Amino acid sequence: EDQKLSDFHADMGGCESCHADGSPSADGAYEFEQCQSCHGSLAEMDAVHKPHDGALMCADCHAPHDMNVGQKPTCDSCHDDGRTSDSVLK
Ligand code: HEC
Ligand code: HEC
């Protein structure tokens, strides 16, 4: 099976690469700060990412314990109008 995104990161840097005291925060804010410490901000990302700057945390799409390395978030998790990744090109 492909590895979970959480475990892929834990192999590099442990659970504490994302979690303070290794325990999850109530709101995901700490974790989101950690994603950005290594990845930077949505403001500097591509056409699917940048429109979400100010609306979402990375984990809202890339749910690390539930999604695998390489797994593409699908837009139907939140938008009901049938848009897909190519919709930002049109
Ligand atoms: C960043 C890439 C992460 C790593 C590395 C680990 N976790 Fe995590 N975890 C992360 C997020 C963003 C969230 C919350 C959002 C979500 O999709 O759940 C979590 C959540 C947990 C939880 C709560 C689980 C739940 O209530 O469903 C636990 C107990 C947790 N994480 C533990 C954990 C451990 C032990 C890790 C090292 C093996 C670990 N996480 C890595 C982000 C990341
Ligand atoms: C630094 C300590 C990091 C933290 C905190 C988070 N990420 Fe990360 N991520 C990091 C690196 C160096 C890499 C590339 C590693 C490699 O060997 O390729 C990544 C990769 C991802 C990926 C892509 C996985 C793939 O498909 O190959 C995603 C989607 C990703 N990271 C998301 C992510 C999120 C949502 C985080 C916070 C919850 C997060 N990362 C934390 C370094 C670090």
Ligand code: HEC
């Ligand atoms: C949902 C609106 C998303 C949010 C919020 C974030 N990401 Fe994302 N990411 C998303 C999609 C749909 C895709 C796939 C794009 C495609 O069609 O290929 C991605 C891809 C990444 C990747 C690349 C993974 C790879 O294949 O190499 C990385 C590294 C990644 N996303 C990281 C990332 C981070 C760090 C975010 C918060 C700053 C973040 N994403 C938010 C959808 C969404």
Ligand code: HEC
């Ligand atoms: C929930 C985790 C989401 C997923 C998955 C995707 N999007 Fe999203 N998107 C989301 C929110 C909460 C918002 C803000 C909406 C608001 O009313 O402020 C957005 C916004 C966009 C936008 C910008 C506004 C718009 O023109 O609709 C675009 C272009 C957009 N989203 C596209 C999009 C695509 C193509 C996705 C799949 C790759 C996608 N979103 C996933 C929440 C979520």
Ligand SMILES: O=[P-]([O-])[O-]
């Ligand atoms: O190798 P394990 O993190 O799936």
